From Swiss-Prot, chain A:
Known partners and oligomeric status: Component of the gamma-tubulin ring complex (gTuRC) consisting of TUBGCP2, TUBGCP3, TUBGCP4, TUBGCP5 and TUBGCP6 and gamma-tubulin TUBG1 or TUBG2. TUBGCP2, TUBGCP3, TUBGCP4, TUBGCP5 and TUBGCP6 assemble in a 5:5:2:1:1 stoichiometry; each is associated with a gamma-tubulin, thereby arranging 14 gamma-tubulins in a helical manner. Gamma-tubulin at the first position is blocked by TUBGCP3 at the last position, allowing 13 protafilaments to grow into a microtubule.
Function: Component of the gamma-tubulin ring complex (gTuRC) which mediates microtubule nucleation. The gTuRC regulates the minus-end nucleation of alpha-beta tubulin heterodimers that grow into microtubule protafilaments, a critical step in centrosome duplication and spindle formation.
Disulfide-bonded cysteines: none
Lineage, broadest ranks: Eukaryota, Metazoa, Chordata, Craniata, Vertebrata
Compartments reported by the entry: Cytoplasm, Cytoskeleton, Microtubule organizing center, Centrosome
Protein family membership: Belongs to the TUBGCP family.
Gene: TUBGCP5
Residue window of the full protein shown: 13 to 130 of 1024
Protein name, entry field: Gamma-tubulin complex component 5
Tissue specificity as recorded in UniProt: Widely expressed, with highest levels in heart and skeletal muscle and moderate levels in brain.
From Swiss-Prot, chain B:
Main subcellular localisation: cytoplasm
Stated name of the protein: Mitotic-spindle organizing protein 1
Source organism of the structure: Homo sapiens (Human)
Subcellular location: Cytoplasm, Cytoskeleton, Microtubule organizing center, Centrosome; Cytoplasm, Cytoskeleton, Spindle
GO cellular component, one term: gamma-tubulin ring complex
Residues annotated as transmembrane: none
Repeat listed as a keyword: no
Family: Belongs to the MOZART1 family.
Domain of life assignment: Eukaryota
UniProtKB/Swiss-Prot annotation, chain C:
Family in the record: Belongs to the TUBGCP family.
Coiled coil spans: none
Organism listed in the record: Homo sapiens
Transmembrane segments: none
Full-protein positions shown: 606 to 666 of 907
Subunit structure: Component of the gamma-tubulin ring complex (gTuRC) consisting of TUBGCP2, TUBGCP3, TUBGCP4, TUBGCP5 and TUBGCP6 and gamma-tubulin TUBG1 or TUBG2. TUBGCP2, TUBGCP3, TUBGCP4, TUBGCP5 and TUBGCP6 assemble in a 5:5:2:1:1 stoichiometry; each is associated with a gamma-tubulin, thereby arranging 14 gamma-tubulins in a helical manner. Gamma-tubulin at the first position is blocked by TUBGCP3 at the last position, allowing 13 protafilaments to grow into a microtubule.
Domain of life: Eukaryota
Purpose of the protein: Component of the gamma-tubulin ring complex (gTuRC) which mediates microtubule nucleation. The gTuRC regulates the minus-end nucleation of alpha-beta tubulin heterodimers that grow into microtubule protafilaments, a critical step in centrosome duplication and spindle formation.
Name by which UniProt lists this protein: Gamma-tubulin complex component 3
Compartment annotation: Cytoplasm, Cytoskeleton, Microtubule organizing center, Centrosome
Reported tissue expression: Ubiquitously expressed.
From Swiss-Prot, chain D:
Protein name per Swiss-Prot or TrEMBL: Gamma-tubulin complex component 3
Job description of the protein: Component of the gamma-tubulin ring complex (gTuRC) which mediates microtubule nucleation. The gTuRC regulates the minus-end nucleation of alpha-beta tubulin heterodimers that grow into microtubule protafilaments, a critical step in centrosome duplication and spindle formation.
Coiled coil: none
Entire-sequence positions represented here: 727 to 847 of 907
Subcellular location(s) per record: Cytoplasm, Cytoskeleton, Microtubule organizing center, Centrosome
Subunit structure: Component of the gamma-tubulin ring complex (gTuRC) consisting of TUBGCP2, TUBGCP3, TUBGCP4, TUBGCP5 and TUBGCP6 and gamma-tubulin TUBG1 or TUBG2. TUBGCP2, TUBGCP3, TUBGCP4, TUBGCP5 and TUBGCP6 assemble in a 5:5:2:1:1 stoichiometry; each is associated with a gamma-tubulin, thereby arranging 14 gamma-tubulins in a helical manner. Gamma-tubulin at the first position is blocked by TUBGCP3 at the last position, allowing 13 protafilaments to grow into a microtubule.
Expressed in which tissues: Ubiquitously expressed.
Gene: TUBGCP3
Species name: Homo sapiens
Family indicated by similarity: Belongs to the TUBGCP family.
Length: 108, 65, 61, 106
């Protein structure tokens, strides 16, 4: 119930669809179920994520975007307080990766 | 309840932390959708499967452009 | 082997070896390449790892 | 790479303590960091310099886009002669169409 709602809102947000009776919506739902019920993936290991996050930090330092690297390590350090860490991290890490700009305008 | 809503403020605080993390990484995801993803990993899910789902869904909006 | 570097000691060509940048969805080899000189003796007391980092940054430029 | 190199070369090869050589190499590389635009405060300077590198690669496309129309006609003109041993009239019309847009872009 809540699972189905989550998958529906995911499709609605990302495909931009507002009609849940669109046949494309039904095809996307069938695709999501068929991808989910086929289990072959590896499960996220924290050590590989740790190697990856320090690698992203070092990559920022080498390209001489120093404040971006400081904010990157800072934001991950603040996130790592209060498993689901590495899930959300691994997700965001593989989804895309770095910009050609700093993309940093936070002034708290 | 009062403590049950300050936890919801706490959820929004980490959601803005992940907002900064999403822009410095240049992802297309917004805040509502990442809360859906957070509920998905509450039930347990491969991030490798969610990324394949979204790596199909975003570049199936570039096929009707 | 073809260039003037051949008549320089095999040790110091051996200590310099290739490296890359860990991947990103817009990879070019012109974005992703480095050389690494790494420590092979007590020279770590002379050459810090962050000194190799500044080395690699001006190398990137 | 001569200034910092001269003063580096001097304060290694005259020095008879390891820490002085260390402290010379350190400030050597550090003033080089300030001398390029790889400092924290000169970064805005750096930002302009990256914008000098865009128009370079842009020009490669814009230069070849001339030859992808201009030069491309003349082998077809040879092929018109290989008939001779109406339609490049249309290419003369195409030139009045191609030239102003590329010129305005330049």
């Amino acid at each position: 119930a809540q699972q189905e709602r989550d998958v529906r809102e995911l499709v609605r947000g990302v495909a931009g669809l507002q009609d849940e009776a669109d046949p494309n919506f039904q095809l996307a739902l069938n695709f999501a179920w068929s991808n989910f019920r086929f289990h072959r993936f590896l499960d996220v290991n924290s050590h590989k994520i740790e190697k990856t996050i320090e690698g992203i930090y070092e990559k920022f330092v080498i390209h001489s975007d120093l404040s971006k690297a400081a904010s990157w390590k800072r934001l991950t350090e603040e996130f790592l307080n209060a498993d689901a860490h590495y899930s959300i991290l691994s997700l965001l890490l593989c989804l895309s990766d770095s910009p050609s700009n700093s993309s940093y305008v936070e002034t708290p | 309840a009062a403590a049950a809503a300050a936890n919801l403020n706490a959820v929004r605080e980490t959601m803005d932390v992940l907002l900064e993390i999403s822009r410095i990484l240049n992802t297309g995801l917004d805040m509502e959708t990442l809360s859906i993803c957070v509920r998905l990993c509450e039930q347990g899910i491969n991030p490798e499967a969610l990324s394949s789902v979204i790596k199909e869904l975003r570049k199936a909006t570039e096929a009707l452009k | 082997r073809a260039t003037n570097a051949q008549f320089d000691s095999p040790e110091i060509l051996r200590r310099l070896d290739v490296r890359l940048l860990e991947v990103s969805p817009g990879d070019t080899g012109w974005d992703v390449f480095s050389l690494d000189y790494h420590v092979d003796g007590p020279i770590a007391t002379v050459f810090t790892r962050e000194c190799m980092s500044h080395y690699l940054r001006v190398f990137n430029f | 790479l001569e200034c910092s190199w001269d003063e580096l070369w001097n304060k290694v090869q005259q020095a008879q303590d390891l820490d002085h050589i260390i402290a010379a190499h350190e400030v050597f590389l550090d003033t080089i960091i300030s001398r390029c635009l790889l400092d924290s405060d000169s970064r805005a300077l750096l930002n302009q310099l990256r914008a000098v590198f865009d128009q370079i690669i842009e020009l490669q496309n814009a230069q070849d886009a001339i030859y992808r129309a201009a030069l491309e006609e003349l082998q077809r003109r040879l092929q018109f002669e290989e008939k001779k041993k109406e339609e490049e009239n249309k290419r003369i019309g195409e030139f009045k169409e191609s030239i102003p847009k590329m010129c305005s872009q330049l």
